[PDB]
Amino acid sequence: APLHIDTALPDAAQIQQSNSWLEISLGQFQSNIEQFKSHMNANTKICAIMKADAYGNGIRGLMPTIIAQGIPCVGVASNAEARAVRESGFKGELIRVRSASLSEMSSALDLNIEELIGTHQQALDLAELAKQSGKTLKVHIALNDGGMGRNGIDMTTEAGKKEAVSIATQPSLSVVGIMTHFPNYNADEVRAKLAQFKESSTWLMQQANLKREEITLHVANSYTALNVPEAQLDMVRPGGVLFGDLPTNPEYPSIVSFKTRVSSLHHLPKDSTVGYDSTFTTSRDSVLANLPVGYSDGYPRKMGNKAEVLINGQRAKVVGVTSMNTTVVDVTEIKGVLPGQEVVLFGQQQKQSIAVSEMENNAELIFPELYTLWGTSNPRFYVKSSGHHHHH
Amino acid sequence: APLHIDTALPDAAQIQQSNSWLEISLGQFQSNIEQFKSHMNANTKICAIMKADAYGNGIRGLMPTIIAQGIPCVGVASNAEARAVRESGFKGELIRVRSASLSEMSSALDLNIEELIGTHQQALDLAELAKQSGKTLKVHIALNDGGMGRNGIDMTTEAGKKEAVSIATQPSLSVVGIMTHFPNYNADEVRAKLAQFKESSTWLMQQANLKREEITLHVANSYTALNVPEAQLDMVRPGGVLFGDLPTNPEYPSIVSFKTRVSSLHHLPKDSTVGYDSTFTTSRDSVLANLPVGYSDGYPRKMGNKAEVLINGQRAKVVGVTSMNTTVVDVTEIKGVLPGQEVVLFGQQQKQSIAVSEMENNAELIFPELYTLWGTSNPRFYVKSSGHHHHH
Ligand SMILES: *Cc1c(COP(=O)(O)O)cnc(C)c1O
Ligand SMILES: *Cc1c(COP(=O)(O)O)cnc(C)c1O
Ligand SMILES: [Cl-]
Ligand SMILES: [Cl-]
Numbered sequence A, B: 001a002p003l004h005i006d007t008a009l010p011d012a013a014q015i016q017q018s019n020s021w022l023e024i025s026l027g028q029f030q031s032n033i034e035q036f037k038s039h040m041n042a043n044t045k046i047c048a049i050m051k052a053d054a055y056g057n058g059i060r061g062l063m064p065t066i067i068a069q070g071i072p073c074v075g076v077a078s079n080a081e082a083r084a085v086r087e088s089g090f091k092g093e094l095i096r097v098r099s100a101s102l103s104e105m106s107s108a109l110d111l112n113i114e115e116l117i118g119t120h121q122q123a124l125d126l127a128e129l130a131k132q133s134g135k136t137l138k139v140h141i142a143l144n145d146g147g148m149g150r151n152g153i154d155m156t157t158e159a160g161k162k163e164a165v166s167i168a169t170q171p172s173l174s175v176v177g178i179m180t181h182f183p184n185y186n187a188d189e190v191r192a193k194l195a196q197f198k199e200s201s202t203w204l205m206q207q208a209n210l211k212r213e214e215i216t217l218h219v220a221n222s223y224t225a226l227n228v229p230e231a232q233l234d235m236v237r238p239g240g241v242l243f244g245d246l247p248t249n250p251e252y253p254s255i256v257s258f259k260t261r262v263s264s265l266h267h268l269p270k271d272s273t274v275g276y277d278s279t280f281t282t283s284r285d286s287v288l289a290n291l292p293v294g295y296s297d298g299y300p301r302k303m304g305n306k307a308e309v310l311i312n313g314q315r316a317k318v319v320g321v322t323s324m325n326t327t328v329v330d331v332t333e334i335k336g337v338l339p340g341q342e343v344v345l346f347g348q349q350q351k352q353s354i355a356v357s358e359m360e361n362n363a364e365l366i367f368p369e370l371y372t373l374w375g376t377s378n379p380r381f382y383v384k385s386s387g388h389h390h391h392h
Helices: A012-016 A026-037 A051-055 A059-068 A079-087 A102-107 A120-133 A158-168 A187-207 A222-227 A356-363 A367-377 B012-016 B026-037 B051-055 B059-068 B079-087 B102-107 B120-133 B158-168 B187-207 B222-227 B356-363 B367-377
Strands: A020-025 A045-049 A073-076 A093-096 A113-117 A137-142 A173-179 A216-220 A256-261 A264-268 A286-291 A308-311 A314-317 A327-330 A342-346 A380-383 B020-025 B045-049 B073-076 B093-096 B113-117 B137-142 B173-179 B216-220 B256-261 B264-268 B286-291 B308-311 B314-317 B327-330 B342-346 B380-383
Touching: A012 B102, A020 A026, A026 A045, A026 A059, A026 A222, A026 A380, A051 A059, A051 A079, A051 A367, A059 A079, A059 A380, A073 A079, A079 A093, A102 A120, A102 B012, A113 A120, A113 A173, A120 A137, A120 A158, A120 A173, A120 B264, A137 A158, A158 A187, A158 B264, A173 A187, A187 A216, A216 A222, A256 A367, A264 B120, A264 B158, A308 A327, A314 A327, A356 A367, A367 B367, B020 B026, B026 B045, B026 B059, B026 B222, B026 B380, B051 B059, B051 B079, B051 B367, B059 B079, B059 B380, B073 B079, B079 B093, B102 B120, B113 B120, B113 B173, B120 B137, B120 B158, B120 B173, B137 B158, B158 B187, B173 B187, B187 B216, B216 B222, B256 B367, B308 B327, B314 B327, B356 B367
Parallel strands: A020 A380, A045 A073, A073 A093, A093 A113, A113 A137, A137 A173, A173 A216, B020 B380, B045 B073, B073 B093, B093 B113, B113 B137, B137 B173, B173 B216
Antiparallel strands: A020 A256, A256 A342, A264 A286, A286 A327, A308 A314, A308 A342, B020 B256, B256 B342, B264 B286, B286 B327, B308 B314, B308 B342
């Protein structure tokens, strides 16, 4: 992960001289949050999950919305993300959503992170950091009832139960949450595992003399929070749906668009090869648009000869394999194309749209594999537009 | 591409609290440059190609070597890269290796870039920038003899020849180079296309009254420079081989390693699922190492259930699909594993090594697709080690 998340929001001139960039719809983000909120039970609260620099969309540009919306908790993965969240002025609960090294945890003490632990050694290490800093550190215990086999303690054996109790009774730590996480979007499996989580967490709280009313039980990602409402419990952990990436729930549109512009227009006669390995050959006299985007910007090699981009409201085929920095598009039958025109690589333009399913099939990746690396490799511009006195 | 390339080189403490990072062997980079140099004809010179933030390896950390080695020319793609090169103090020739938008070219005027043009409109636009800035701008003309169908002017038709002459005779520009680029590593095809390039460039120089001895003819990437030596001409453009990524020439080892550390060690009984979609189930009581690296750091989802990582000098299988931020490894039969130990995701550790071919097969990507995004998504640490008074 990036060591530092750049502090400045790109301005319009900076975007103008960028090769490619992300346009983030702040109004769509606001709307997705409000829509999500409308489905949450009275007794739950929201922890907005902002790992991978807010799913590529950018923590620094999005935090003012999180604050305005009064969201009480934010989740992150890296220390740089935790810093960006605190630097926005956010004074709510900040949780880490993964296991983190002792070095990570120690360097983050001033950020007031609630770490996520699933092993005795993590508890011992944090207890020592607590002792050395003259305080009690707040932690969440990850349980393995969901079957992720990832950050949690499995309690299906005597040894696992014993280890869980040791975690939960560690001197110098305050257990503020107990959680699990589900591996798929199968509502019936989630319900079965939720029941087991209730049993395990109840048992653990009894053994460790924890007080139920002081513990936040949380298990739900975006899918679960909306589609298994009885799993909302004390707190939900939506990430993807806020950003409009919950495949089961298309009523939350994606907030991200990936754009570039036409740099130059080149005339190539019939029977001309394009790109490394000469995988495409023109069948007619052609006009090709040269775009200064390639796989080092996160537009994969596999897009070549498969994907279309949008130029002047029309679909144009990407021809030849993508280069490291450049993509070539066939604009022979698109009229009105000129250098400098905006190109949509993912998103909408006039009446055309590139679907997520379209991106995934062409890239042979899942959508978050694309957008998380878009976000480390391109500047973000936060577009704010609607009608009167309204966000979207 | 990133809007700004971070100015500071990560220090040791910063790396210690990073989740994952790249280790760049500066001695190997130095050695690759010196070895490459030893094969260059007396009459050629080197333009080190540093696009995509030096192929993920980092312009800022590598420029002092380029300067010490007296390399006369550097190539870049983005304005941020051009800035990072000039900010190192480099006062040699700086060329752009792709078509760039008018907005990019205009904002870069103070960087003294020699742009790469293949269309009349680019020539007209640059001539106007030259006029407005009260100078003559230096340019390279890209010709399409190599058949990339990308940044160049195709001259196989009367219209293409006429356009090439218009580019080459544009008032207020100084043509300092004429170039092409080859689409594959087929030495016989390269030789045939080289002959055609000589014919085309000779013809163009005659028509535009250019003086041969004032023009740098350049056609060779890494492969071509080493394997078709008659194509070295006046200047070569090696990128990949300097960084140790020339598949045909394994005698230039890769300079990059991708690392993380063991965050936590988890006991999971037989018949336990791991990861989203539960694609792996333990067949025995297991100990799993939780690593804080995932696909948002550039370690792809496809690595899961395929790849191995190196821990304590031993290969360990990645189990379950990679998460956005976390990877799980089976260390049941690896002794000596402890939290905090270094993990090699790509590179060497003791007597073990992960091959490039291994990475490509598992990721289903070509190597530069991996490392360019590693470099936008992780800090770089420049390791300097050898024996006495020597770089490597
Ligand atoms: C990322 C993640 C979330 C958010 O998941 P979505 O499916 O994007 O809503 C919540 N909790 C944990 C532990 C996660 O890793
Ligand atoms: C990137 C590129 C190079 C360097 O290519 P390698 O195969 O990495 O040596 C040289 N010239 C141009 C025009 C390029 O695009
Ligand atoms: Cl988990
Ligand atoms: Cl080219």
